[PDB]
Symmetry: C2
Subunit: 160 residues, 2 copies
């Protein structure tokens, strides 16, 4: 079928993780307002101390139209991605215990000022960029270990 891609917002994303962004978020005035601290945007929840790792994933832009047929999940850790030069990107997510719960399947496009943190065990699509090669500051467990991949009905993202 067709998967409609919608604007990313914290509320629409909240069942799946957290949106990293400043717009309309509560902050603390630090150093007599020299810094505005937009606090507690996401929580890293990783099983092993020694595996709370910062990396950079440099991702090629997808060809469009874009069709998807599987999602991946990381039971052992959250996974945050924050584009490093203001890039818009696209995310697909689903809840579901053993397998993607297809009724929970949603797709979002960011506004270029947003990163995402997927909660542990939440289904999402493998990382890809939008339009241009994009470096994504990553905070996750790293490796290719304890990643479950499950097929989904083939569908085409629609940016109407």
């Amino acid at each position: 079928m067709k998967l409609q891609v919608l604007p990313l917002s914290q509320e629409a994303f909240s069942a799946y993780g957290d949106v990293i962004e400043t717009q309309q978020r509560d902050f603390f005035h630090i150093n007599n307002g020299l810094v505005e601290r937009y606090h507690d945007l996401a929580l890293v929840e990783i099983l092993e101390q020694d595996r709370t790792l910062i990396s950079i994933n440099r991702a090629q832009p997808a060809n469009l139209p874009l069709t998807i047929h599987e999602l991946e999940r990381h039971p052992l850790g959250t996974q945050a991605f924050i584009p490093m030069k203001g890039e818009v990107f696209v995310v697909v997510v689903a809840l579901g215990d053993d397998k993607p719960d297809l009724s929970t399947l949603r797709a979002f496009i960011t506004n270029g000022e947003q990163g995402v943190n997927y909660h542990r065990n939440v289904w999402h699509h493998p990382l890809f960029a939008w339009q241009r090669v994009t470096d994504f500051l990553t905070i996750d467990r790293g490796g290719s270990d304890n990643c479950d991949v499950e097929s989904i009905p083939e569908q085409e993202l629609c940016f109407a």
Copy 2:
């Protein structure tokens, strides 16, 4: 008295934390090259289990001449800062157990493609931006608790 600011490099910064960047760093080819995973750039070390938080700190640019007279340190966690739109920024670091070991005092300027992760307990300067307001993606314990602050001999950064 004059503190000279030098190019940021991994080898020069290594006693103090890690440089987050891709240039000349080992990576993994993922999804038949579609992603390059620059892995293990920095390790977040926060021992309390619910306190690894992602935030954004939006920092005003300092005025030059830049003069410093104190450093802060966080005994309970690492603190990473990665600029969000490729901004250059300036860092000041020192080692030292109870107090800044003045012989270890260094200043660095980044090339715009770099973030930093201060190791736990490393003295560094309170966050400031360079030239323009800069948003820094932040991974740390958050709050203003368990932060030690220590005067150092006043000094002027020199960018010669």
